[PDB]
Symmetry: D2
Subunit: 164 residues, 4 copies
Amino acid sequence: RGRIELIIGPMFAGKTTELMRRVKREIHARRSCFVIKYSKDLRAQAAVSQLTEVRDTWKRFDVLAIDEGQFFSDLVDFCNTAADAGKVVMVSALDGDYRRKPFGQICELVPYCEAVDKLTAVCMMCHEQPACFTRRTVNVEQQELIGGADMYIATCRECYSKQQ
Amino acid sequence: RGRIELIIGPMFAGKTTELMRRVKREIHARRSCFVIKYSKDTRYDEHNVALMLRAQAAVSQLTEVRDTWKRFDVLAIDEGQFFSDLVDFCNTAADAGKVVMVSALDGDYRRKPFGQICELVPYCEAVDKLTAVCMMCHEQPACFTRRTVNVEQQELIGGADMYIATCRECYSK
Amino acid sequence: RGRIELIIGPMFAGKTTELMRRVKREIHARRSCFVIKYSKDTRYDEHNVALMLRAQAAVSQLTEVRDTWKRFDVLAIDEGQFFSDLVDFCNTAADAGKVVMVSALDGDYRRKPFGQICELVPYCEAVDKLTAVCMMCHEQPACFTRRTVNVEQQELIGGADMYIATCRECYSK
Amino acid sequence: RGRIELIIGPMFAGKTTELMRRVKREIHARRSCFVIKYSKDLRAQAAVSQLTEVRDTWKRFDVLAIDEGQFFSDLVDFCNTAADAGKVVMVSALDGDYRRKPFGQICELVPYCEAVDKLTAVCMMCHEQPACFTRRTVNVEQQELIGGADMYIATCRECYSKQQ
Ligand SMILES: Cc1cn([C@H]2C[C@H](O)[C@@H](COP(=O)(O)OP(=O)(O)OP(=O)(O)OP(=O)(O)OP(=O)(O)OC[C@H]3O[C@@H](n4cnc5c(N)ncnc54)[C@H](O)[C@@H]3O)O2)c(=O)[nH]c1=O
Ligand SMILES: Cc1cn([C@H]2C[C@H](O)[C@@H](COP(=O)(O)OP(=O)(O)OP(=O)(O)OP(=O)(O)OP(=O)(O)OC[C@H]3O[C@@H](n4cnc5c(N)ncnc54)[C@H](O)[C@@H]3O)O2)c(=O)[nH]c1=O
Ligand SMILES: Cc1cn([C@H]2C[C@H](O)[C@@H](COP(=O)(O)OP(=O)(O)OP(=O)(O)OP(=O)(O)OP(=O)(O)OC[C@H]3O[C@@H](n4cnc5c(N)ncnc54)[C@H](O)[C@@H]3O)O2)c(=O)[nH]c1=O
Ligand SMILES: Cc1cn([C@H]2C[C@H](O)[C@@H](COP(=O)(O)OP(=O)(O)OP(=O)(O)OP(=O)(O)OP(=O)(O)OC[C@H]3O[C@@H](n4cnc5c(N)ncnc54)[C@H](O)[C@@H]3O)O2)c(=O)[nH]c1=O
Ligand SMILES: [Zn+2]
Ligand SMILES: [Zn+2]
Ligand SMILES: [Zn+2]
Ligand SMILES: [Zn+2]
């Protein structure tokens, strides 16, 4: 029946690719899938900034796939409500922000998950080690800052701490 | 090389057994291990009977161990949910090159974050969530712990007399 | 450092997608990747439309690639069950320091070992078996592939017209 | 219902400990377990050299746990027969012998398994790397040779190939 599965890791770890692998796998067995994306960064897709913007539309689907779950403030209630109604809920997210603080409600969701898979990146500094962290490479304080390789890199533990 | 590995799941999932599997594996390669346990959980000792590269300590605060961890290659912290200084302690060790391994419940009986376990996740190179077998329906994996006695507080020491592991359907029933 | 990683499972499990996730991850760290595909499986190309550190080759024997693999950090072999020289090729590369990653069916439609996949297992640093969703009962994970047309031979190219992924109960029914 | 789960890896990887963790987990949910061991190296234990020596006794148990599965010549038929009758079958074994050849029927079982978990040891030569292989440290040819750390060590790939 219902469950919540979490796919976490740093940036550049292919978390969305693993989410969509799980989605495609379900589509092959003719189960219907609703993919929800973050608007500011047998298949339907929606882009929103709050999960309430989707209303009741999720009820018609067997599987819900939430991408970049760190940005949704109502994630926990939304996922449990769906999983309680028998949906397979899958979330892709960063567990940590650039300071390794809990990003959004991701760490809060952990106790509700039937499964949690932490994916690694490859360290983009030493090229020699798995990366579990994200370092911000530009001097901006704010937690939410949208960007890719131009402003963030994945790092191992030794390279995260190099300099500051 | 320094790292933190987290072993989580509900009660009855064999988390300590997995922690000690990782410890025995390191001992075979002659790396030294420091096992730290929570002194107030006395179930094992009060109803059960008694290596060269292994040390064991039982404490209620991780500061009670001071610097002794520095002499060991590997630190293995059991029932990590009960230690308030877990995050700072694990990072300080991992940054000094220790392999830190923690066994803990991620969730309490209400599925609220237990201690600093959920806070540690962003610091971990690895996170393995283990399942139990649901002790109500017997036919589903269990990811949650239900408290079977009517006590509100979060810390309450006990085993199968006071808790059972459950699937999602049986947690809410 | 050299290694072999094996990605197995039944059909419809997204094995190639996981292989390419591992490839894209390496490309982000500017390590170069050589993707090798089986030339006779033309399903993707015959019904579908068309990076700097990536190369792709389509062959029926791994010798058709000669030495070209030596210039790459990572080798990604897709549908490995069809290559007869897989074991020797993967070890030679891994021993020369390549990260070798193979996606393959471990079992054919009779659950017999497909090609040299089962033979490779003892050489692998890692083995991940992926599940599909059972295409018969829709409510169980699938670990097997059933052939839905009456053909005996082992190699028979096709997709969902000719095969479905099944749980254990639905494989035998 | 029925399934076959395989726990493989080199020596010194704690494979039997992971097998027994799965057994203990089942016992907590009052499911009954039959542990079968290799005689030459809610719970019952048997030590045998052939799985036929157990006859029909396995039928009374919910869960079967076969240790050192590499030594049983009838493993595949035995596991499928049980899993087909609705047993949870769990096997702990070496997938490779000291030359990295398939040990017994372990590699043959893979296509029948719902799950396969390969555990690592820590390399007992360089102490610095995970070990996936077993090296024999005494000059004996024969495949079956019972022993522990006195005659075998776990190694990474680089240390397996050191010298010969
Ligand atoms: C550290 C930090 C980050 N962020 C911001 C910066 C970023 O804008 C975003 C990353 O958040 P995420 O890591 O959850 O987002 P994803 O991009 O989903 O993470 P991935 O691991 O998926 O990224 P990769 O770079 O590995 O993805 P890759 O596959 O290499 O890149 C292709 C791009 O296309 C998308 N994509 C990939 N496969 C797709 C598919 N099958 N269908 C649809 N879209 C797909 C991906 O989302 C990615 O952006 O959040 C902050 O605001 N604060 C912070 O402190
Ligand atoms: C849900 C909830 C629980 N609790 C309390 C209740 C308990 O006092 C404690 C459990 O915390 P845990 O689940 O982190 O503790 P463990 O017992 O470590 O978890 P396990 O997953 O290991 O438990 P099992 O019951 O599966 O362990 P098992 O092997 O069955 O039992 C034997 C006991 O012996 C120890 N043990 C087992 N194998 C061992 C080995 N190889 N070496 C040394 N010791 C070993 C284990 O610690 C276990 O408690 O926390 C709360 O206070 N509030 C709550 O909301
Ligand atoms: C059981 C059996 C099968 N076969 C034959 C039938 C087939 O011809 C082939 C399947 O062999 P595979 O299962 O190893 O082949 P894949 O297609 O590689 O397995 P997947 O698990 O990847 O299949 P999916 O169906 O889940 O893949 P999907 O994503 O759904 O489909 C899209 C196709 O595009 C490719 N693709 C998917 N993502 C891609 C990406 N990111 N980049 C490049 N290519 C990508 C994939 O190869 C897939 O075939 O072998 C036999 O000959 N005998 C037998 O007994
Ligand atoms: C490479 C090679 C090996 N062998 C032989 C040599 C050996 O005699 C045997 C190892 O075969 P295995 O690796 O399947 O056997 P296990 O010992 O089951 O492997 P483990 O990974 O479990 O061993 P470890 O050394 O990590 O186990 P450890 O936990 O450190 O050691 C304690 C011992 O007690 C047993 N044990 C451990 N936990 C137990 C529990 N909970 N209940 C009962 N017994 C338990 C274990 O089997 C081990 O022998 O096979 C060959 O004949 N030919 C070869 O080419
Ligand atoms: Zn690095
Ligand atoms: Zn249940
Ligand atoms: Zn089915
Ligand atoms: Zn080594």
